[PDB]
Amino acid sequence: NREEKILNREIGFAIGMPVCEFDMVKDPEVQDFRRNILNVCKEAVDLRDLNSPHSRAMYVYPPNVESSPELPKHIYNKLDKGQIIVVIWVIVSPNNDKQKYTLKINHDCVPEQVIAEAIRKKTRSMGKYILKVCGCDEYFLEKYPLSQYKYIRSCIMLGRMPNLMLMAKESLYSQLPMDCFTMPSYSRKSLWVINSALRIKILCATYVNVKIYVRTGIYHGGEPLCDNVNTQRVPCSNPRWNEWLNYDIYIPDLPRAARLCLSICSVEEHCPLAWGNINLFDYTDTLVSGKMALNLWPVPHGLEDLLNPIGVTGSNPNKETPCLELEFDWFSSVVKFPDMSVIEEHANWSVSREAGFSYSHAGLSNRLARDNELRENDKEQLKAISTRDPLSEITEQEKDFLWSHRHYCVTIPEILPKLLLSVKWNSRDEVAQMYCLVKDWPPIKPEQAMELLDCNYPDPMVRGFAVRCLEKYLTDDKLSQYLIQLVQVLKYEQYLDNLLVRFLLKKALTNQRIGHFFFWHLKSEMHNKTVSQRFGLLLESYCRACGMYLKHLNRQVEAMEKLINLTDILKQEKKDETQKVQMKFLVEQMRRPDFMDALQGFLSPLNPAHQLGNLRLEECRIMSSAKRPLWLNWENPDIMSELLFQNNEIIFKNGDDLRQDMLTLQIIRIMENIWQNQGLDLRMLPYGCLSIGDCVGLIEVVRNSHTIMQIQCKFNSHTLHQWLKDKNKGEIYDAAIDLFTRSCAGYCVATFILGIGDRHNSNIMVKDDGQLFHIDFGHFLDHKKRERVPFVLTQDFLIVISKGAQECTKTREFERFQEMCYKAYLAIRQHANLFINLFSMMLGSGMPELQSFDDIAYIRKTLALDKTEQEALEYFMKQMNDAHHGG
């Protein structure tokens, strides 16, 4: 069709690859994913056309609301007896004359009441409307209490006056095109009865351009199901074997997520050359048989073991790589994994069998359950085990213990991860019973459920339960917050079509705020040939059904492409020139017709609520930094821009990997949020940062900020205190000292916990109002490979806290500061599992300082998790005492 070819061109531009390349893939899993995923697209469209135009408007402008209507105690204390002053703006006559109406209303007033009160005040000056945030495209389209909107909750917590704009419903509705989605043209046995041991034949290898052998292993996630089996040491000039390998496992005992993990190794001096993993079952539940070829992957930097089970599963798309040929066993017919009915029957047969076991029969195994023998000691031991962090070692005795008491475990549902790690995944009698307990398992918090999606949990039944917990209890706010982790754990799915991908895609196509960041996280990794087919196909499905937003995403993609091209020219053809010569070249290139239009009139990828109007060339700069970052400035075309910011500014940087910074910034926001609900107000600055491609992204501009260096220059340790004292003269002096010490306490604790790169005067920034914050988070955890203190409070910082006192280490102000630090540290300690899990979910991402569970072990040290709460406080204090050489 003409409309189809036009749409296919648009999708190609968005993903950065032509749709016709997907058509060419002869792999029934790829073509089935394309067809089958389309029902998620249909479902999402139906939900968006349910209550038109309002439900279309709710998709485009979802309420940016907090997870709970309940406001914290210290926040309410900022309100005039639970009441808020809000300003409502009405544009009257086509002259664009702005009229304001100041209202004093209850914090929990619904937008409809707020509107009625604004029209009363407008009428006293003598339902067909919606409220909009002044200066940006944020709307209050739903019946939430006003204080539940993040914008209002923020204005309350910052002692800022909210500015809302009354707008006719039909003015917004008319600006929402009806997007009628079209279905693309591509939309149109045996079982457990295999009485045999596992044997896989390794035939030969091609493209082996260097004696050598092939190492093999049967894995369930990163765990061996039997002993590893090596081939003979044949010479590399003739890599042939035709040798069958025998495994210590019965074919009916292979779990659903079992994989063959292999590598070509070179011999006392063992070293892996190329590696590759294969699923023993395909996406149809079929056990793989006969001849098959696998293109291997390059050994990653710092890979000690001969195998890579935690590595990507599938053939390398690059076919000019070592290609191992192998052959799997063939039986009577095609073998399939048994269905739930067969599994449920087997578990019930096993359960009933065990229930009739004599005292002495149960005595034969420590894994054997003893009915009505569960004492309160056993019950307390189980509770103690369940409160341990996810990285705590579960001993073999504890594993036998947990499994024998799996029926009591149902009563403490948060023990599910520990109990799942205690199962003998190579025992079908155990796994069948694990399934039936998972099928009826009480639901757990989405934060506990997220862990079950990491690399330690490959089983589909387990991942399905976790997805079900996200579907019932994960709010759109929390989904937005953990989207990066959720997108990463997709790479851990055995197959293209799964329940996690279906849930994410449904939410992306049902909420444009989610859809926006979902698109960008996927797109940013499209250069990675390990994920580009998975992420490309998911992008294609998203682009066919997101509606009008594809056209807006294309404006964003083109703008970024131009900025990448421009900065690639400045770095490779203007690198040695002066800033003046580079600026002249830049302003002449951005003025060109092949650039001017592509760089203005689009939505900010950092926050699509921000419209980027005309580019203000005279305000744009090439920043002094090494990677020649662009400080870009555009006019905000909003009618009421003057109430937020008249010019939207962003930093574009081409050269640095921004992925560790996004993770740290995300963790800073989560820490601040925990502290804020806990009652202790330590203001943090998790500025926006979005990786849009390979070492390329955006950084949010922080207005009225200066490095510690800039201050100390325009010496003495009282310079910083005097600068702040001068910037905040009069009664406002104390509010600035309180904000400095509070933000300072937050960063001391956050940076100590996370092991961030060493702090200096050009790494630390201060706002005019006293808010201190850190920049450049490219280094974290055990990156110095014994625990560091990256943020050392010098005399300058302590002199500010102690209000200019000489003996700042011995003041009331410093004792108050220390208490903020201990309270902050103990609050994070209480939420350790969350942080541990956020980090564990990012292990598959190629982050250089997050490669294994030993890198995450660093926060187990900084949070003194094996210790008691008081010994942990004493530990933190010693770390602070040692670094500062004082106390």
Ligand SMILES: CC(=O)N1CCN(c2cccc(-c3cc(-c4ccnn4C4CCOCC4)c4c(N)ncnn34)c2)CC1
């Ligand atoms: C007005 C103007 O154009 N100016 C004055 C302010 N200048 C200035 C001076 C010192 C620091 C800065 C500076 C550095 C950073 C920052 C935070 C995280 N990363 N980075 C940058 C990103 C690019 O690569 C380097 C690190 C930021 C920021 N977010 N907002 C405002 N200023 N700012 C900015 C830059 C030039």
